[PDB]
Write a protein that binds this ligand. Structure first.
Ligand SMILES: [Zn+2]
Length: 257
């Protein structure tokens, strides 16, 4: 039912998902004047050498690259996190134009896109159990700006033509998610939610300060995808981002000075 249209987009999600009006919704604007450096925050640790990508899928709202999360092959630890979080999928949100597309903003600035690397806490034993808990998920969010090409993104861009419409998928093995990281892993963190329905308040957000650069050619490939299924009227998969939600009572902490 839900999507990003005038009729079914973020403004309306609360009708079927009333947590959309909740106290810990994502994304948020990150005000660098109030998001204070916290010298107790630890560095992020990613152990991705055994990461095992399986498939890439157009699910009608984005494309997901899915990973084998049956063992500790690709894990996020440290930062604000207690214990071990396994990578299950990554996906992006992006705009129709370069000046919009990110979900998080930084002093109201919107980036061209935002990458989300979705991990779940092995405390809970599978993703479905994890999403029911406040400490269930950790999502690493990485901004994209348009400039030089990102070499590590090219493998993704090169298969998007094979999953144009909703429901299409392709084999996608041997993808290295380290290739999507920026050089600095300085971050902001706060407690929040999934940014699509069901909007569950189960996420420790970790949003990197440093954007990655992608080329105009790369992000243009994103914008050729379709929200629709095969044989339906074309609706380009663009502006699949939720806008900033109220911070309410929450604290955003910065890992860096
Ligand atoms: Zn996302």
């Amino acid at each position: 039912h839900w999507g990003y249209g005038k009729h079914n987009g973020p403004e309306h999600w609360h009708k079927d998902f009333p947590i959309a009006k909740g106290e810990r919704q994502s994304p948020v604007d990150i005000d660098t004047h109030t998001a204070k450096y916290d010298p107790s925050l630890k560095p992020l640790s990613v152990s991705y050498d055994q990461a095992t990508s399986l498939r890439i899928l157009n699910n009608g709202h984005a494309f997901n690259v899915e990973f084998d999360d049956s063992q500790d092959k690709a894990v996020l630890k440290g930062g604000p996190l207690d214990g071990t979080y396994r990578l299950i999928q990554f996906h992006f949100h992006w705009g129709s134009l370069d000046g919009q597309g990110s979900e998080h903003t930084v002093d109201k600035k919107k980036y061209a896109a935002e990458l989300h690397l979705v991990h779940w806490n092995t405390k809970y034993g599978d993703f479905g159990k994890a999403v029911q808990q406040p400490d269930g998920l950790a999502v690493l969010g990485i901004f994209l700006k348009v400039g030089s090409a990102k070499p590590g993104l090219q493998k993704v861009v090169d298969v998007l033509d094979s999953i144009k419409t909703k429901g299409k998928s392709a084999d996608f093995t041997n993808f290295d998610p380290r290739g999507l990281l920026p050089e600095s892993l300085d971050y902001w963190t706060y407690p929040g939610s999934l940014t699509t329905p069901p909007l569950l308040e189960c996420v420790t957000w970790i949003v990197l300060k440093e954007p990655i650069s992608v080329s105009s050619e790369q992000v243009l490939k994103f914008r050729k995808l379709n929200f629709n299924g095969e044989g339906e009227p074309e609706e380009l998969m663009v502006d699949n981002w939720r806008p900033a939600q109220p911070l309410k009572n929450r604290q955003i902490k910065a890992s860096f000075k």
